[PDB]
Symmetry: C6
Subunit: 321 residues, 6 copies
């Protein structure tokens, strides 16, 4: 047909466009409307609604799910900047609920307890735009194909340690520079590999059925798509990245960003922005810490200014090695 | 002979028919007459009777058996809706007891402590209908062949984690779509695969006897059936499945269904209904939360409603 | 020889004969006279005398021996029904002390700390009848050849988990059906297999002496017999088993029976009778719980009766899963 | 020298002559003058002097040595029956001290902490006779060759469990019947196997020196004896055991004897007598346990007496593993 | 153009120059202003600034970051000797701040939680001089190609154990002695080796991309250079070393220096000076222990003085095993 | 050329002669003056100055270094017999302080925390005499070549277990006998082996450099010596050992001497004397136990006397097994 192409396109651009306006900023994690207020007052271009911090209980033996709906409502009310909420990997009901509730963006989040061990949410079917984590280029591209409108690093949550975030950024960038040194048929090789994870359910079922674990040409693997059809779509996304030299979506740093210096570092690595959660609340005057983070991002190239922002800002959390 | 077939078909259908009546509802685990009352008031379509929670017994590393008879009877005497009860895998006698006690459906359950390491109950012999667990299409078909009237997922009991139920639904569902893309010959092979588990006893014995672990053509392996005979029957079941594009019996989610959200998710994956556990009765307001689950199962296709259902304060 | 073949044929018919005298009922484990009294009031066709619970000594990290003669006395001087006692495996002196002490039958039991790493008591040289455990046909045939008058399943002692009992019955029963389907050439092979455990001591010695671990034609191995001579006898015990489709001796179920449903189950699997142990101690109501077991064995094919019998009882031993 | 062989042989006969004096009775471990008298009054043939019970030293992380001289002396001055004492394996100075103190026999004991990783004491040099433990014929023979006047099972010290003693008796006996079905040529091979452990120090030093671990035909390996020379002596001892059908020296069970039935059992296995240690003074009523065991050894082939002997003797030791 | 080229190849020579100032002296880790003084008065040629000890932070599993700008400031305000601060490996931003804050030298220290898992800071782009730790020659040459002005041993911090410093020193020196023995072609191959670590990211990314891990002649690996480009630069540095028989920059000992004797030992091994951190900390009489270590370095080839130097010094600082 | 090596043979022999002085004696580890005084009173021919009895700093997970100079001076002034002191292995600085301090002997000791991971102190350059431990002939001969004046067995420190001392005495002894049975050429091959450990640092550096681990005939490996030069010197000491029938230096026993009999054992093995430390002071009654060890070394061959000496001597340290 001639539509559904200029329609699906227009719908994709719309979503990606939303994410654009949070560029150059800091998205802060808040647990109560009190916090949501400090955050807006500090310069957060957005907030991330939480009840308990997913990083401990579950990670003191629990299951971390969607935040309670009323607790989210309360946060959307208290502030005028956009508000986000997390859902569990693959949990379509949670996501829809978060979307009927009218959140601005949904985080399909590895920090919550995953709910489908095979498949992420097919985000292209939603109206709310999604942000998703990636540890490397393959992850970023899979999430994007699925419909992700924004990408952040997975990093290392709850630890306040920047290392993992840096690894992910580098893994993604080096994989882009590699794609650019590549021929079109080489790039299609990468697309095949990047599409292997979608096979996981088909292969398990083959083994349960006593058949050999190999790809079959016409067999739907995910949401009606054949393996080849996924490769092809990923390929196109890979050429688009070859041309742009970065992800075709807004791309943030997340996980372990604990100080103005940490924040400046990701910007220096070419990130569009920064998520921070634990880092801030804690310390003896966090409103200043929150503000520091905000300022480090605006002035990430000016050392003399970062040194000023840093002067007396509180006490950054005890992390985890 | 030919009247035998007609019988097997009619009894099957009578049993499967009972399960259809709970289709589309929430079955709740209860530990007393008070709780079974809360459930019936909330809209549960049936309740599962227990005394102590098996998940609890086995975290403390106990043996988990069928609940005490007098206790099952207290729950039956509290409610008008169907009452279910659990027995240990292979525990023929626990199951004959529950049937004679007059429970509506028996759950041959893997959270109780298995009683048979080789074989499940031959459900076909019972007049009471059974529900069994399945982790994959292979288990489900084995249970159906043994005479299960109803299948649920095994999931992960007592965690609140939905992940393991989702895995099993995805494992069964994909396996069915696979079946539908197959020739009748190729399916016979899957059948050959799904009957393999019935050989564990014969093979153990052959090892104990210094013999090699091989199938024999006329060696009766289970309840009089030889391996080839079970493969034949299973094959027929696989063929019925190909036509239907789903299991031929009511099929429910169970194991970790802890939120209206979770309940909706399973219904969106084609499950006929949801089992929920004692979890509901810990927490501020057990009725209401029970009503939230029941309503989630009634409105799983409309997020606006689920969102209001979720929004309950608790006070 | 002439009068020789008749001697033990008639000697064994005579011992096995005693067993036939309890087939069809329950045998309870009693640690005193007040419990042996309670037990007879429930119908127990016999009792097993205990000082302490082997299971409990074992869980304690200790050595479990035959009971104090005085404790055995206080039991045989409390009831009219037959009395049995456990001896450690291989402990010929413990068994003599029990035979001399009068007791009706000795249980050579693996719940007690084993006293011989290689051989069991050659029971044929005794006057008292013996019951031995078996976990599969090979074990039962071996015990019977040694002269056991009665065979029981080993099950899993002290757990209250009937599953091990079930396993041992199915292993024995299926092994018998396999036998019924074999040619004599073939059963001889099973015989060869079944006699191998007797070679353990000879093989350990060959190893200590710098020699190859192999069988020789005239090496007496146990109580006089060669490997070959054991093969032939066991082989004959096999053929006998083929003709009956069961064991040539009474065959009970022990280990794990914690409820009347459990007892019912074992009868329905073709067990001559049932052993139960101290599950009745902490019952919490022992006189009651003990009657239930007895009725259940009596009306095992009657689900409506089993339902009533199960009506009420204490909390019947938590078990170990 | 012909004459030197006759000192060897004649001195040796005299030593064995002392061991024959304790044949048929019970030797008790004692820790003080009070237990010494209890042991003697109960009917011991000898006592064995130790400080702490070792292995109690070894339950603790401890080093177990020869008992203090004042203690051994307190015991010799408390009884008329022979007093024995332990030294650490290879501890030649300890054994000389014991000899100088007046003990009638020295037990080079595995239950103390060994003081030599390669060699035992060359006991022929001594005037006091030694007793040594053995786990198998290989060991018994080696200890005999080195000059043991007496051999006991090693069993399993301070557990109360008889199984390890029963293991070692059966290993030694079965190995003896093995010799007897063998040719002098075959037996020679077993002697070579039985002398390999004297090579332990030589091979280690080879490896440290960079040379292959091989035997050299005139290399002196222990007390001036060469490997070959030792194989010869061991080989003659084996021929001797072939003819005798037992060890050429007095042979006692030891390790885990905890009850009169244990004692009866060992005698029924053709042992000469019994050491008993923990079994008596770790029980609740030591004086009574002690006489019962003594009477058990004397009437081991009379079950009716063993039964009366076993009536009311107190609670045995726990014990272990 | 040619002026920037010029003044740039000369700022390297310049930074190395700076390090010469601290030669023959002691550098001390300080945590507050008080301590800074004690250490200038004691004779430190320089102090190292922390708020807390990284060791303590990591023995307790937290995240060791840059010190607070306050604490660094106060310290800089308390002394006239050159002041140093540590930053996390790879933390471009933490360094730029320190430089932009006035610090005389930056330590890219492995005792702070690393920030980049692939690459160290490109120190040549910096104005401030950097010190870096080395375990062996390849590591030293790598930190030198990246622009380090001075090198120290990594040793082992927070342990008071000098043996790791000594190993690193020996590994370096022996490697240099080995360079001095090679033809230029062999030194090239070493250089090929010394550059491999730069391929970590490229290799990780190729694996994620599904491609064989191989080197590609024209692909930039680090800060624009290809592998081949790095190999050549590292080869030139080995060549300058083959001629100096030494490292082309100042070279100190660090980690595990705890007593005058240790300080002296490091000077005896050819080092330019010592870092000390924990040593002085918590020492009975801080000033005394401080001067003692300094005097030790000044008079390290004069044992008679060392002796009187240690005479009644308040210490000895316990450290892990 | 060889007008230069005679000053050497001169100072070396002068050194060895000093150890000749403490022969036939007991050296006792002491930790203060009172203890030192006891040691001299009991008849020690020397004390070893210690600040923390063997393995205590080990047992507290610490770093064990040279003792405080002020505590060594205390001891030197409290006795008249030679005072020895310990230094860390390879810690030249610690040694030069000890020499400069006037101590009579330096024990480069494996019970202190080693300071060099590759090399021991090159003792020839010292004027003060050194004692070194050894586990086997190889280790002895290395320590000797490096200039040890006396050797001690290492055994195991602070365990009270004599067994490790015996292992070492016997490994050296047997190795010496094997030498004496060897053709001069064979001996050369042993000297090649004993030289290998000096390749350790070289091979390390090669592996880091990408080079194959090989020996190159001209490379200075340790203190200017090539590998082959080392092999040559050790060959020479071997041949001396072939003539002497023992070590060219005084050779003591150490590690695990806890009782008078232990001490007598080591003398009966050929040892010259005994280091004791823990044995005496980790003992209920030191001074009496002190006199007993001494008396025991003076009468190691008189059993009647060892017995009296052993009377009422107190309880020895418990030990570790």
């Amino acid at each position: 047909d001639k539509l559904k192409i200029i329609m699906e396109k227009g719908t994709e651009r719309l979503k990606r466009g939303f994410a654009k306006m949070v560029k150059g900023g800091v998205i802060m994690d808040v647990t109560n409307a009190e916090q949501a207020r400090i955050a807006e007052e500090a310069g957060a271009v957005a907030v991330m609604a939480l009840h308990k911090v997913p990083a401990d209980i579950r990670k003191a033996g629990g299951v971390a799910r969607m935040a309670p709906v009323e607790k989210i409502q309360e946060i959307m009310d208290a502030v005028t900047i956009p508000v986000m909420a997390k859902c569990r990997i693959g949990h379509e009901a949670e996501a829809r609920i978060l979307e009927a509730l009218g959140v601005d963006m949904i985080d399909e989040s590895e920090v919550l307890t995953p709910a489908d061990p095979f498949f992420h949410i097919y985000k292209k079917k939603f109206t709310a735009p999604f942000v998703c984590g990636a540890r490397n280029l393959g992850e970023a591209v899979r999430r994007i194909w699925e419909g992700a409108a924004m990408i952040r690093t997975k990093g290392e949550a709850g630890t306040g340690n920047i290392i993992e975030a840096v690894r992910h950024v580098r893994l993604v960038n080096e994989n882009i520079r590699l794609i650019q040194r590549m021929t079109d048929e080489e790039i299609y090789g990468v697309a095949e590999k990047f599409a292997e994870p979608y096979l996981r359910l088909a292969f398990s079922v083959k083994e349960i059925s006593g058949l050999p674990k190999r790809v079959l040409e016409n067999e739907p693997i995910y949401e009606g798509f054949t393996y080849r059809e996924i490769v092809e779509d990923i390929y196109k996304i890979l050429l688009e990245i070859k041309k742009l030299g970065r992800l075709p979506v807004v791309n943030f740093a997340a996980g372990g960003v604990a100080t103005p210096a940490d924040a400046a570092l990701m910007m220096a690595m070419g990130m569009d922005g920064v998520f921070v959660g634990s880092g801030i609340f804690k310390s003896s005057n966090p409103p200043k810490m929150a503000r520091a983070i905000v300022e480090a991002v605006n002035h990430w190239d000016e050392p003399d200014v970062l040194a000023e922002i840093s002067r007396e800002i509180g006490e950054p959390m005890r992390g985890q090695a």
